[PDB]
Amino acid sequence: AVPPSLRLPVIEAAFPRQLHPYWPKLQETTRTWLLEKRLMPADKVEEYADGLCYTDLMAGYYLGAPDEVLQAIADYSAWFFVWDDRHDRDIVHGRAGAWRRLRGLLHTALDSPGDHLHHEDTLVAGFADSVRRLYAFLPATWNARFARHFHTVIEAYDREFHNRTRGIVPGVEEYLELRRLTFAHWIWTDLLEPSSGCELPDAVRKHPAYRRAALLSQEFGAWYNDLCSLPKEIAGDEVHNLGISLITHHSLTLEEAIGEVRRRVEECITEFLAVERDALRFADELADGTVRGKELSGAVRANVGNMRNWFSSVYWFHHESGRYMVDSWDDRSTPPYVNN
Numbered sequence: 021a022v023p024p025s026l027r028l029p030v031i032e033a034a035f036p037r038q039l040h041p042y043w044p045k046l047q048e049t050t051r052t053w054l055l056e057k058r059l060m061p062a063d064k065v066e067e068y069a070d071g072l073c074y075t076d077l078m079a080g081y082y083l084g085a086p087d088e089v090l091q092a093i094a095d096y097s098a099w100f101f102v103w104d105d106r107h108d109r110d111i112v113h114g115r116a117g118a119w120r121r122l123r124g125l126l127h128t129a130l131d132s133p134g135d136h137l138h139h140e141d142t143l144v145a146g147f148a149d150s151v152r153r154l155y156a157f158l159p160a161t162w163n164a165r166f167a168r169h170f171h172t173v174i175e176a177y178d179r180e181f182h183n184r185t186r187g188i189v190p191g192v193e194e195y196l197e198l199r200r201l202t203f204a205h206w207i208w209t210d211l212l213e214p215s216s217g218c219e220l221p222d223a224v225r226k227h228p229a230y231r232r233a234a235l236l237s238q239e240f241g242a243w244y245n246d247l248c249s250l251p252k253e254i255a256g257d258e259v260h261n262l263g264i265s266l267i268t269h270h271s272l273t274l275e276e277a278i279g280e281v282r283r284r285v286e287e288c289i290t291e292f293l294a295v296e297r298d299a300l301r302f303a304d305e306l307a308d309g310t311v312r313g314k315e316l317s318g319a320v321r322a323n324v325g326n327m328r329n330w331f332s333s334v335y336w337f338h339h340e341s342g343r344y345m346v347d348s349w350d351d352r353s354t355p356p357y358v359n360n
């Protein structure tokens with residue numbers, strides 16, 4: 021039973037969950053990978069990894085992905101959670117130098133992952149391994165776009181580091197802009213393409229229906245994370261959360277902020293339903309009788325289907341994952357699964 025304040029009947033009724041058939045193998049393979057890359061200590065991997073549901077989250081999203089593509093995405097995503105944890109810990113412990121160096125190494129590795137496969141920082145080596153594998157699926161033009169997007173993500177994380185160190189809470193619009201980067205909207209959107217086996221031409225992926233459907237899917241995910249992770253984030257002195265920006269710059273109470281975030285989340289769903297019709301119509305138009313047209317149509321249709329799957333995957337992930345279960349921690353400011 022989902023807590024009343026977080027429950028979204030529309031998701032539960034109109035966005036039925038899906039699960040990729042590779043999930044059982046995926047869960048164990050990512051667990052092994054976390055252990056082999058030493059991204060988490062062995063006993064924490066044993067106690068916590070499965071319960072974190074990181075593979076479940078990706079397997080409920082990129083339906084139809086080749087197993088190897090799903091595996092690389094899942095490893096990358098688990099890495100990404102561990103990076104969020106590292107960033108948090110560096111901030112909490114005032115490790116400005118260690119963060120600066122990691123930030124620099126990630127920019128470098130992103131451009132030449134092969135060279136960093138056995139780097140001394142296991143977090144960098146893990147990143148390089150997943151990124152090298154992601155770069156092996158589609159042409160270099162897709163790789164360059166992924167890299168362009170992720171350079172931007174790294175810098176958003178740096179801005180977060182400085183906000184939290186300088187005690188700054190972003191304004192609401194400032195936050196909403198930053199959140200498209202810290203949640204990595206365009207990375208998850210990029211990864212739809214290797215999942216359906218086709219780098220989409222700019223003309224296709226920048227079609228206003230495709231763009232808007234892709235945006236709304238990610239806005240839902242980010243803002244629903246904000247709604248559900250708010251307790252953990254308040255407990256851990258995190259300042260980046262739509263609710264926190266509203267309490268700060270619009271003078272709402274906690275109750276009022278939760279309500280306003282919920283409303284913005286619900287609106288995302290019905291805005292998506294409307295644009296989804298246009299995106300699927302676009303998918304139909306691409307099927308003009310030609311082989312290429314059919315390829316493009318099928319890929320857009322699969323991608324839009326997965327933009328829809330993201331809603332239900334993110335929704336349930338927040339109620340299933342140990343990551344947000346702050347009520348169960350002895351110290352609410354220090355999640356048990358992070359390296360402190």
Ligand SMILES: CC[N+](CC)(CC)Cc1ccccc1
Binds near residue numbers: 203
């Ligand atoms: C740190 C969390 N994460 C995933 C790695 C980084 C952008 C965003 C996210 C949170 C919850 C669900 C889905 C994505």
Ligand SMILES: [Mg+2]
Binds near residue numbers: 104108
């Ligand atoms: Mg976080």
Ligand SMILES: [Mg+2]
Binds near residue numbers: 104202
């Ligand atoms: Mg974060």
Ligand SMILES: [Mg+2]
Binds near residue numbers: 249250253
């Ligand atoms: Mg959060």
